[model samples]
Target: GSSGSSGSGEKPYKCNECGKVFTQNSHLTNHWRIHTGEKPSGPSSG
Candidate 1:
């Protein structure tokens, strides 16, 4: 019966550039591209 406002504090990855919180470092790393103007290394699907 553990249902007391289950707002678990699990998000640890934070973006200093936008103060955004991510659930994982990989997510945070991808977010960094927005600020760094870096395009992912892959074929452009157009």
Candidate 2:
């Protein structure tokens, strides 16, 4: 599961499986597609 923490690292949001880091959680979540081979989420249609 994903979790959040406080810190001042250059890239805070991290991917647990691959150890990749991002500036934001949204980016990290989207990056998970690379490891899981899952489709990235789509924009809202409304």
Candidate 3:
């Protein structure tokens, strides 16, 4: 299993629309921004 504060030590957040992946929920929330054009300051569409 994963390990970390949120018990999600490893990548967990997965894009339902694409095969993309995320490590944290917050990151997912921020990643989804690209879809809605809400956030666009991340590293990549990973």
Candidate 4:
């Protein structure tokens, strides 16, 4: 489903650490939390 680097809407959010880019703001938002170690808890280990 990945449309590729920055998609059609021109995703403006850029990761300061890795320089990884995404197509949506939501994708960038979710990834930023990963850097802050604030992921939502889940019971599944896999």
Candidate 5:
């Protein structure tokens, strides 16, 4: 039961707009902000 990031030699998520690959969905979600030209969400509380 793995979640979040991936291990070596493993990348699962790909951005259709730019063909960028990411190890996790969260990475893709953050990358899309660039393609959409949307301002980044405020500060992260983490």
Candidate 6:
């Protein structure tokens, strides 16, 4: 008898700038900005 096999999906987010792959959107964006040399503004919330 053969057992069932579970397969995991590959990284969904891929950076076109560096061809890097990230499993999460947050990670992708975090790295994506490095290429653009962009920094997030200060956090100010009431």
Best by lDDT: 5
2 against 6, candidate with superior lDDT? 2
Clashing pairs in 6: none
Q: Each model's TM-score?
A: 0.53, 0.53, 0.46, 0.47, 0.53, 0.53
Off by over 4 Å in 4: 1-10, 38-46
lDDT of 6 by residue, 1-46 (tens): 9856433545668887867778789999898676674544545321
Prediction 2 TM-score vs. true = 0.53
Clashes of 4: 0
Question: CA lDDT, every prediction?
Answer: 0.72, 0.70, 0.65, 0.67, 0.73, 0.68
Location of the lowest summed lDDT over 10 successive residues in candidate 3: 2-11
In the range 1-46, model 1's lDDT, one tens digit per residue, is: 6755423664657787867788889999998887685665666543
Global Cα lDDT for candidate 1: 0.72
For candidate 4, write residues 1-45 as lDDT tens digits.
775654455657777756778777888878877667555465533
lDDT of 5 at 15: 83
Span of 10 residues, lowest total lDDT, candidate 4: 37-46
Candidate 3 per-residue C-alpha lDDT over 1-46 given as tens digits, one digit per residue, 9 for 90 to 100: 9644632554667766555677678888776666765555666654
Candidate 2 per-residue lDDT, tens place, 1-46, comes to: 8756646645667788767778888899987876675543665322
Q: State residue 22's C-alpha deviation in candidate 3, in Å.
A: 0.9
Between candidates 2 and 5, name the one with more favorable lDDT: 5
Off by over 4 Å in 1: 1-10, 38-46
Cα deviation at 26, candidate 6, in Å, is 0.4
Instruction: State the displacement of the C-alpha of residue 13, model 4, in Å, after optimal TM-score superposition.
Output: 2.1
Regions more than 4 Å wrong, model 5: 1-10, 38-46
Residue 13, candidate 6: C-alpha displacement in angstroms: 0.6
Candidate 5 lDDT over 7-45, as tens digits, reads 455666788786778878999999888878565466633
